[PDB]
From Swiss-Prot:
It is found in: Periplasm. CDD domains: PBP2_HisJ_LAO. Keywords: Amino-acid transport, Disulfide bond, Periplasm, Signal, Transport. The keyword Nucleus does not apply. PANTHER family: LYSINE_ARGININE_ORNITHINE-BINDING PERIPLASMIC PROTEIN, MEMBRANE-BOUND LYTIC MUREIN TRANSGLYCOSYLASE F. This is Lysine/arginine/ornithine-binding periplasmic protein. Belongs to the bacterial solute-binding protein 3 family. InterPro entries: Lys_Arg_Orn-bd, SBP_3_CS, Solute-binding_3/MltF_N. It comes from the Bacteria. The keyword Transport applies. L-ornithine binds at D11, S69, S70, S72, R77, T121, D161.
Length: 238
């Protein structure tokens, strides 16, 4: 038996996947997916906002039951928690000022100030490959502070999910004078294989129900109808 109310944690600072509208209500693709799956699962769902780096600890502590927050499915995370089937693809890419020669390389980022989300796969990658080697990698409680430090010049570059940067910043007025700096960063190990619903390992029935709802809403075309609100491309991937 699934719980009468499935509590879903999300970090609402990652448009267009999860953010807040003017009323403070949860909006974005993650929210739409979550709500549609819950509908099909015939359970009530209650969204819970928290910082991104608090989601997996909250899940483990049973303060929430699920995470839908562009949570990348990684080898390392799977040693701690479970995942539903893939919700959508997620690649990492740097952003910087328009015209920046910055590339996702150690040589290019020497003496540069680079922002990453605390508890993200991007922080993991940046800390290991760049911060130890002298690059000023700065971790942030949330992505909106990163964008703001970038636009104010405190940061030279930021590393986050490509689609989030693109739709949530670059294509917005705030990011008109900014661009991707270099191609997406390739690293299977660190960045994983798309995003999924984060779940406790022993909640097998809940995972199965999420997986069932997801397959069904993909199959009947509801996934693509919801995605078109945000994207003119195949957000799902392969
Ligand atoms: N709602 C968010 N802030 N999501 C951040 C996700 C970034 C990256 N995909 C990760 O799992 O670490």
């Amino acid at each position: 038996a699934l719980p009468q109310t499935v509590r879903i944690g999300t970090d609402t600072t990652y448009a267009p996947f999860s953010s807040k509208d003017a009323k403070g209500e949860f909006i974005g693709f993650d929210i739409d997916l979550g709500n549609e799956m819950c509908k099909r699962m015939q359970v009530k769902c209650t969204w819970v906002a928290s910082d991104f780096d608090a989601l997996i600890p909250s899940l483990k502590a049973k303060k929430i039951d699920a995470i839908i927050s562009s949570l990348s499915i990684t080898d390392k995370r799977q040693q701690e928690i479970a995942f539903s089937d893939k919700l959508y693809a997620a690649d990492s890419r740097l952003i910087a000022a328009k015209g920046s020669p910055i590339q996702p390389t150690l040589e290019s980022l020497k003496g540069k100030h680079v922002g990453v989300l605390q508890g993200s796969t991007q922080e993991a990658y940046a800390n290991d490959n760049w911060r130890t080697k002298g690059v000023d990698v700065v971790a942030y409680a949330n992505q909106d502070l990163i964008y703001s430090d970038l636009t104010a010049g405190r940061l030279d570059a930021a590393l986050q999910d490509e689609v989030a940067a693109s739709e949530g910043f670059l294509k917005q007025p705030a990011g008109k004078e900014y661009a991707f700096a270099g191609p997406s960063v390739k690293d299977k190990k660190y960045f994983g294989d798309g995003t999924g619903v984060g779940l406790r390992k022993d909640d097998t029935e809940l995972k199965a129900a999420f997986d069932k709802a997801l397959t069904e809403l993909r199959q009947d075309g509801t996934y693509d109808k919801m995605a078109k609100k945000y994207f003119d491309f195949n957000v799902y991937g392969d």
